[PDB]
Each structure stands twice: as C-alpha cells, then as structure tokens.
Enzyme design. Structure first.
Site, PDB file in Angstrom:
ATOM      1  N   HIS A 109      -6.822  -1.653   6.480  1.00 48.75           N
ATOM      2  CA  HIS A 109      -5.989  -0.658   7.145  1.00 48.75           C
ATOM      3  C   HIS A 109      -5.915   0.669   6.033  1.00 48.75           C
ATOM      4  O   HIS A 109      -5.634   1.658   6.643  1.00 48.75           O
ATOM      5  CB  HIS A 109      -4.666  -1.330   7.069  1.00 48.75           C
ATOM      6  CG  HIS A 109      -3.302  -0.371   7.402  1.00 48.75           C
ATOM      7  ND1 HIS A 109      -3.130   0.305   8.423  1.00 48.75           N
ATOM      8  CD2 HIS A 109      -2.538   0.034   6.606  1.00 48.75           C
ATOM      9  CE1 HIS A 109      -1.964   1.014   8.532  1.00 48.75           C
ATOM     10  NE2 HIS A 109      -1.549   1.066   7.229  1.00 48.75           N
ATOM     11  N   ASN A 161      -3.072   3.939  14.952  1.00 46.63           N
ATOM     12  CA  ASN A 161      -3.337   4.615  13.959  1.00 46.63           C
ATOM     13  C   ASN A 161      -4.253   4.272  12.736  1.00 46.63           C
ATOM     14  O   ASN A 161      -3.622   3.360  12.261  1.00 46.63           O
ATOM     15  CB  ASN A 161      -2.255   5.530  13.427  1.00 46.63           C
ATOM     16  CG  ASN A 161      -2.306   5.814  11.880  1.00 46.63           C
ATOM     17  OD1 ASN A 161      -2.955   6.908  11.660  1.00 46.63           O
ATOM     18  ND2 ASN A 161      -1.708   5.347  10.836  1.00 46.63           N
ATOM     19  N   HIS A 213       1.069  -1.215   0.182  1.00 47.31           N
ATOM     20  CA  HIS A 213      -0.059  -0.060   0.109  1.00 47.31           C
ATOM     21  C   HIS A 213       0.886   1.238  -0.082  1.00 47.31           C
ATOM     22  O   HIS A 213       2.101   1.251  -0.053  1.00 47.31           O
ATOM     23  CB  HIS A 213      -0.892   0.032   1.086  1.00 47.31           C
ATOM     24  CG  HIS A 213      -0.330   0.087   2.515  1.00 47.31           C
ATOM     25  ND1 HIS A 213      -0.067  -1.046   3.119  1.00 47.31           N
ATOM     26  CD2 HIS A 213      -0.287   1.208   3.454  1.00 47.31           C
ATOM     27  CE1 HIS A 213       0.474  -0.536   4.383  1.00 47.31           C
ATOM     28  NE2 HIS A 213       0.241   0.583   4.699  1.00 47.31           N
TER      29      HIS A 213
HETATM   30  O   LIG Z   1       1.533   1.540   7.466  1.00 51.12           O
HETATM   31 ZN   LIG Z   2       0.001   1.665   6.285  1.00 57.31          ZN
HETATM   32 ZN   LIG Z   3       2.099  -0.312   8.519  1.00 56.68          ZN
END
Ligand SMILES: [O-]
Ligand SMILES: [Zn+2]
Ligand SMILES: [Zn+2]
Ligand SMILES: [Cl-]
Ligand SMILES: [Cl-]
Ligand SMILES: [Zn+2]
Length: 230
Positions: A148, A179, A83
């Site tokens: 995520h 986070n 990502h």
């Molecule tokens: O990340």
């Molecule tokens: Zn990430």
């Molecule tokens: Zn990560």
C-alpha cells in the site's frame, strides 16, 4: 459485533476487545466526500498500553485517548505508526503532548516529513529490508516489503494470534483498489506472500479499514490488487 462505518459519527472512537489485553480502535473520517472507517490496535503490556496507529486526525486521536482511559484505564506509553499517511500519523502531536513516546521507521518519518504529515519522534531500527522483524514489547513488527506504501509495517501479537495488517490488507467488502497513489502495485502481492509466510498461524487479521477476518484477507487483497494492476 464489530463497529461499522455507519455506526460511528466522525469524531467518536469505538474500542473492540479481541482477546485478553488486545483491542482494536475504530474511528471514521471524511475524505473526498465519503466516510471511511479506520482501525488501529491497542496491546496491553503489564500495566501499560502499546498503541498502534492514530485514529486519523487530532480530534479523533484525543477521543481515542479518552476512550482508552474510560474503557481500559491504563496509560498509553508508546505508539507505533505503521506508515506515513494521516490515518496512521495524524494525531501524533496529540499523543506526544499526552506523554506518549511515538515511534515509526526512519522511512515512515522521512516520507511523513516530505508529505507534510506529523512525524513520530522515535525511530524503529531493524525494519528497512523486506522480511525484517523486530520485537517491540508485546508485539512483533514486520516489514513485508512495499505494498500500500513503501514503508508499511504489519504488527503481530503472538499471545493472541492477532495479525494487524494495516492498509496493506483490505477487508473483504472492498473489491476495488480505491486509492493506491503511494502504492507499489508490482510488489504488493509479493509483500503479502511474505506476511503469509511469516505469520501462517494468524487467527485474527485486521485490515487498516473495515471488518477483521482470517488469513483469507491476504488472498483477497492480492486478488483486488492484481485486478487493479490489470
Ligand atoms: O491510508
Ligand atoms: Zn495509507
Ligand atoms: Zn489507510
Ligand atoms: Cl518521548
Ligand atoms: Cl522515551
Ligand atoms: Zn522518548
């Protein structure tokens, strides 16, 4: 056995052999005053290596290449970033300069460009719909859905039953979300269930950060994500 965040100075990279021709790479980075470990993957294909994710920054990624040369001694010829965050693309320019063909989905490339992160050169086609899978040399790439991040990919090594979940999967030690600024919390448990449904045979599951385990890391992650949702 597995290298832990306490054992790795920021700037060093450890390798951990999982199976014949499959390793993880482990690096550490400071972020908001804390030190985090971070995992990627290395998969042999004949006399070349496929790299999954950078080692979180240019310095770490140069150390990664040096550790690969020292411990394995085969060239990394392609890399996939799973990502757009800097623990996945930070270091792409180092890879490219070393002659690595860097890859990511169009979505990841788009998001990296928006965010100001390094942009892998090549595009991975066939991964834009949840549930899509494509072969990429010795691995399968799977887009489980937003989790995520909206672009997160998972990687499966069928010869070794290794499932690299990346940052969509949490290690067991992490019992709070941390986070999730770019996450799709509403979809994340559904995306995890797609991973379970597609790779139920997985034996070695690797989170983006921290200790590997089995498929129980998937239910664990859902538990944490649902608790954060609430
Ligand atoms: O990340
Ligand atoms: Zn990430
Ligand atoms: Zn990560
Ligand atoms: Cl290239
Ligand atoms: Cl190329
Ligand atoms: Zn190329």
């Amino acid at each position: 056995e597995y290298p832990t965040v306490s054992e790795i100075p920021v700037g060093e990279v450890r390798l951990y052999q999982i199976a014949d021709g499959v390793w993880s790479h482990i690096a550490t980075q400071s972020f908001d005053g804390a030190v985090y470990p971070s995992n990627g993957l290395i998969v042999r294909d004949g006399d070349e290596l496929l790299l999954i994710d950078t080692a979180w920054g240019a310095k770490n990624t140069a150390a990664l290449l040096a550790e690969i040369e020292k411990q394995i001694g085969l060239p990394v010829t392609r890399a996939v970033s799973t990502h757009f965050h800097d623990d996945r693309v930070g270091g792409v320019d180092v890879l490219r300069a070393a002659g690595v063909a860097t890859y990511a989905s169009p979505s990841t490339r788009r998001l990296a460009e928006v965010e100001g992160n390094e942009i892998p050169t090549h595009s991975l086609e066939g991964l834009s719909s949840s549930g899509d899978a494509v072969r990429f040399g010795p691995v399968e790439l799977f887009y489980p859905g937003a989790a995520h991040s909206t672009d997160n990919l998972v990687v499966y090594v069928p010869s070794a039953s290794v499932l690299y979940g990346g940052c969509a999967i949490y290690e067991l030690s992490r019992t709070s979300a941390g986070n999730v600024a770019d996450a799709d919390l509403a979809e994340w448990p559904t995306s995890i269930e797609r991973i379970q449904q597609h790779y139920p045979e997985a034996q070695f599951v690797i989170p983006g950060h921290g200790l590997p385990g089995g498929l129980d890391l998937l239910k664990h992650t859902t538990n944490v994500v649902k608790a954060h949702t609430n």
